[PDB]
Design a protein around this nucleic acid. Structure first.
Length: 927
RNA sequence: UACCACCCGUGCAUUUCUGGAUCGAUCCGUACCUCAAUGUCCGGGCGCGCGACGUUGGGUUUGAGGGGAAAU
């Protein structure tokens, strides 16, 4: 028998294992997976693709502006039209005019019709709203997007009014609806006359928005009902400076925030009433709602931070009880009404116009940088006018004195901040910094400095674990701000984009240290309020409203400058991105089966078989594969599928873009395989596994759902010394995305494996479920985890051509996290298959583990363990091929005396020992 | 069993058919994205210029994962 190291629960074999485990599931759902088939085009053919008509079509479909479908739909809704599944529209409701947010207006108009809405839960509200707006399975839009659009675009306003019996009062609401309809362009892509085929995706985005909005509104009804007046944080809590460190506001500021919250609770009851359609200005209601939500978010965040600090303090208290008594004196509660209503994403689409956007962002980066420099200059001038000079070292010495209640310590802190920015920098920048610090000789061991900047490990300054030893005289001698300025200048001279980014970062760091030197004074509002058009958090806005501001709030406004500049830097540093257009129709997928032009020697073993392939082999006399399939079609019609799967063939897709002229027969769901016909198409590229999936469809094992054509236009960006960016368009790439339902052709319950997620790998202990006794214990190490933790910099730097221009942040690290989760899950599944056992995971990922490692483990845990959160549950179901619930035949949970619910993972060398312990805890649970 | 040896990073490359039918054999299927490995580059750290000291350590799979689109 293969040891686990040689065992191969991988690829299609692991998909088959997952599928059999899912067949054992007591509760499951039908799941699809989308496979991407790169179409094969030659360079001339790719050049001949014109993505302009496609971009027009995508803007009309996915756009939220004028001349898009969303605009026309919203206009119909606000004109006083009600949507009916089977002309699919009628004029009933009174027209709603003057709503800046059309989606919000629609949701409110539909909700006005609903009665006794407050008892209705978020889910029910969403359902009713979407039924009213999109008419189940988007049936009304079939008329409106095709024939209706033609009617509104080509029908006198008076005639429209006469047809739908509309009174003269609503004539205005109608005129914009007619004008919006006319503004829509003409669909030319995919051989489609009108927008009706695309109607599914529109329906779907609108429905997701409806659900989210309804859920938010009901969470707030709940919050407003729960508001209990007079909750206040104890004065003692506020007084504890240690507990306060890192709430980013003052105690007085927090009390002001709670009073603001009660006034806005009143305002929000009123605003939610207005949004459910009771009446009044939807736009004002929206602003009120958003402000209150932001307030309630900031308050909750602050409270959670304070609670975490409290928990840490309690953990440290330990044996000492005086500290515990002080903690009970400061003890605070988080009110149930306080609860984060997070910011909600609006409907957004179309494709970004790269060149216009790049001009805008060059301009913006230049402007923001100039403004930041000017602001810094102004702050410096105000402090100088008063007559006390900013000095980072003096300020740091004062801070150290306050913390005790030194010049060396100040210098050490400055050097440490510079060092952290250089840890964040590229290898060449790290090298420059290291060389310069060795030339200065401040570090006792240049080795320590090298390690700190390159290996990102160690600390030069500790804040009351030993800080790095330094030559004090040399340290007092070398200024650090000038060193930073020189490094920045040299990196800008390097004129390499990584080096330019590092220069920008170091300049920001220097400005930040100079500002940290500010004395403890009152500063006017003028210096404090950012002129960069940046969005500001509630706490900072409340601090800013006050005429006199502290050093820390001025620092925070400078940090806002820094953040805008950093986003603009990410936008100008990128060398590669793509503009992607996805088109999906309602029609069934037609593939083209093209038989290869060759001579096929069918096997003689095929000849003697009793299967469909055997029958087909018997009838064939022809020597060319097209002739052979025609022969099987004529003689053994049932045997066609298996013969076709085995014969020489290629898969093609028309894509309505021209392509190779081929002699092929269409393969379509439900319909029988067609007669050979002259068809055009683009060959679909894929490996043997993907081609096997399509072959299975011929037999009847796989079903293909509606196709999605993704066109990507690749772009390259270059930045000159002045930072103007130039963008160049690559040849377009077309791909077909196919959702596939695969019938699973006809163990978990017999044993159970306890999985421990350790820092360097995983540990497993396998216990027989019936006797609850250990069979074998072991450790499996994960190169992929260790590798991720190490190559963080490569991932960040990796150019992604695929990454969209719209993206405002780097997500290469997130994609790598996805691959890591994949790999750990693979190891767990492999162990399970080897022992025929069900996974047991620790319910809670340990807090001690590093951020990224912790996130990976949480994802792994979700993929197996049962969790309440919908996202987690959906991920787990998708991973387990539709398996939502399992029931154990002989295991009963001791606590409720109910048969074990497995999903299929139950919830409960160092790694090995910890896994045996988890297994033991699960054993104790079930008894 | 055999195999291979300080620990990593950074940049640049190269490679990976990994799915089926039928009775090991014959024939279909052409190979996408990502990671990884490997090679190389330059740069750290550690032990005593170098790099495991018969005995150790490490890995072993048909390298691994792929559910999109939207978003964040």
């Amino acid at each position: 028998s293969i040891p686990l190291h040689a065992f191969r629960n991988s690829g299609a074999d692991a998909r088959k294992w997952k599928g059999r485990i899912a067949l054992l599931a007591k509760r499951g759902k039908e799941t699809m997976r989308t496979l991407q088939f790169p179409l094969e085009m030659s360079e001339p053919e790719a050049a001949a693709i014109n993505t302009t008509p496609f971009a027009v079509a995508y803007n009309a479909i996915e756009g939220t502006g004028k001349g898009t479908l969303f605009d026309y739909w919203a206009k119909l809704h606000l004109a006083g039209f009600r949507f009916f599944p089977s002309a699919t529209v009628a004029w009933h409701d009174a027209p709603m005019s003057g709503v800046q947010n059309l989606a919000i207006g629609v949701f409110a108009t539909c909700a006005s019709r609903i009665d006794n809405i407050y008892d209705l839960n978020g889910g029910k509200l969403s359902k009713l709203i979407q039924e009213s707006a999109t008419t189940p399975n988007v049936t009304a839009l079939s008329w409106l997007f095709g024939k209706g659009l033609e009617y509104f675009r080509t029908t006198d306003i008076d005639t429209i009014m006469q047809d739908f019996n509309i009174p003269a009062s609503a004539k205005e609401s109608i005129k914009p609806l007619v004008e919006s309809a006319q503004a829509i362009p003409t669909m030319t892509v995919l051989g489609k006359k009108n927008y009706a085929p695309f109607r599914p995706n529109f329906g779907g985005k609108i429905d997701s928005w409806i659900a989210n909005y309804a859920s938010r509104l009901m969470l707030l009804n709940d919050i407003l009902e729960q508001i209990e007046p007079g909750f206040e944080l104890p004065q003692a809590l506020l007084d504890n400076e240690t507990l306060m460190s890192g709430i980013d506001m003052t105690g007085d500021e927090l009390k002001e925030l709670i009073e603001a919250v009660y006034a806005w609770v009143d305002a929000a009851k009123q605003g939610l009433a207005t949004l459910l359609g009771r009446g009044g200005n939807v736009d004002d209601a929206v602003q009120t709602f958003e402000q209150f939500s932001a307030m309630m978010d900031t308050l909750n965040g602050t409270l959670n931070t304070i609670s975490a600090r409290y928990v840490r303090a309690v953990e440290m208290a330990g044996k000492d009880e005086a500290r515990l008594e002080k903690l009970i004196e400061c003890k605070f509660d988080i009110p149930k009404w306080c609860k984060s209503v997070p910011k909600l994403v609006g409907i957004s689409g179309g494709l970004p116009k790269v060149e216009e956007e790049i001009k805008v962002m060059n301009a913006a980066f230049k402007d923001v940088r100039a403004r930041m420099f000017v602001r810094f200059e102004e702050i410096a001038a105000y402090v100088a006018s008063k007559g006390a000079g900013m000095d980072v070292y003096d300020a740091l010495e004062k801070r150290e004195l306050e913390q005790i209640k030194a010049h060396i310590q100040a210098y050490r802190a400055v050097l440490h901040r510079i060092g952290r920015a250089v840890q964040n920098c590229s290898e060449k920048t790290k090298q420059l910094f290291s060389s310069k610090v060795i030339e200065m000789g401040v570090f006792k061991n240049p080795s320590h400095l090298n390690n700190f900047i390159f290996n990102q490990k160690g600390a030069i300054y500790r804040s009351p674990h030993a800080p790095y030893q330094l030559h004090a005289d040399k340290l007092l001698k070398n200024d650090w701000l000038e060193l930073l300025a020189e490094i920045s200048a040299t990196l800008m001279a390097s004129e390499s984009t990584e080096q330019m980014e590092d220069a920008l970062r170091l300049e920001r760091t220097r400005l930040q240290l100079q500002l940290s030197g500010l004395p403890d004074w009152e500063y006017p509002a003028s210096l404090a309020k950012p002129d960069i058009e940046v969005e500001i958090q509630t706490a900072l806005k409340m601090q800013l409203a006050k005429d006199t501001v502290t050093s820390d709030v001025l620092q925070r406004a400078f940090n806002l400058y820094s953040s805008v500049l950093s986003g603009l830097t990410f936008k100008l540093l990128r060398r590669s991105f793509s503009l992607k257009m996805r088109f999906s129709v309602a029609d069934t997928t037609q593939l083209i089966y093209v038989p290869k032009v060759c001579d096929w020697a069918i096997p003689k073993q095929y000849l003697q078989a009793e299967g469909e392939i055997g029958i087909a082999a018997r009838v064939v006399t022809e020597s060319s594969p097209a002739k052979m399939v025609t022969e099987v079609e004529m003689k053994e019609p049932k045997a066609l599928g298996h013969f076709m799967q085995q014969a020489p063939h290629d898969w093609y897709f028309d894509a309505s873009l021209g392509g190779t002229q081929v002699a092929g027969r269409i393969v379509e769901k439900g319909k029988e395989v067609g007669k050979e016909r002259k068809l055009v198409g683009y060959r679909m590229r894929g490996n043997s596994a993907y081609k096997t999936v399509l072959d299975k469809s011929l037999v009847g094992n796989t079903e293909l759902s509606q196709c999605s054509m993704i066109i990507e236009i690749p772009y390259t960006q270059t930045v000159d010394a002045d930072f103007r960016a130039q963008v160049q368009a690559g040849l377009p790439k077309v791909s077909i995305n196919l959702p596939v339902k695969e019938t699973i052709t006809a163990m978990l319950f017999d044993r159970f494996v306890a999985i421990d997620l350790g820092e360097r790998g995983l540990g497993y202990a396998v216990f027989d479920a019936k006797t609850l006794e250990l069979q074998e214990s072991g450790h499996r190490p994960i190169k992929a985890i260790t590798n991720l933790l190490n190559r963080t910099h490569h991932y960040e730097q990796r150019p992604n051509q695929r990454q969209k221009f719209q993206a405002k942040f780097n997500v290469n690290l997130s994609e790598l996290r996805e691959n890591t989760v994949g790999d750990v899950c693979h190891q767990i599944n492999r162990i399970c298959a080897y022992y025929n056992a069900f996974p047991v995971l620790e319910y809670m990922v340990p807090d001690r583990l590093d951020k990224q490692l912790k996130s990976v483990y949480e994802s792994v845990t979700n993929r197996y363990i049962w969790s309440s959160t919908d996202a987690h549950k959906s991920a787990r179901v998708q991973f387990w091929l539709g398996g939502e619930t399992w029931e154990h035949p002989y295991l009963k949970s001791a606590k409720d005396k109910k048969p074990l619910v497995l999903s299929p993972g139950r919830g409960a060398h160092a790694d090995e020992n910890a896994a045996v312990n988890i297994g033991g805890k699960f054993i104790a649970d079930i008894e």
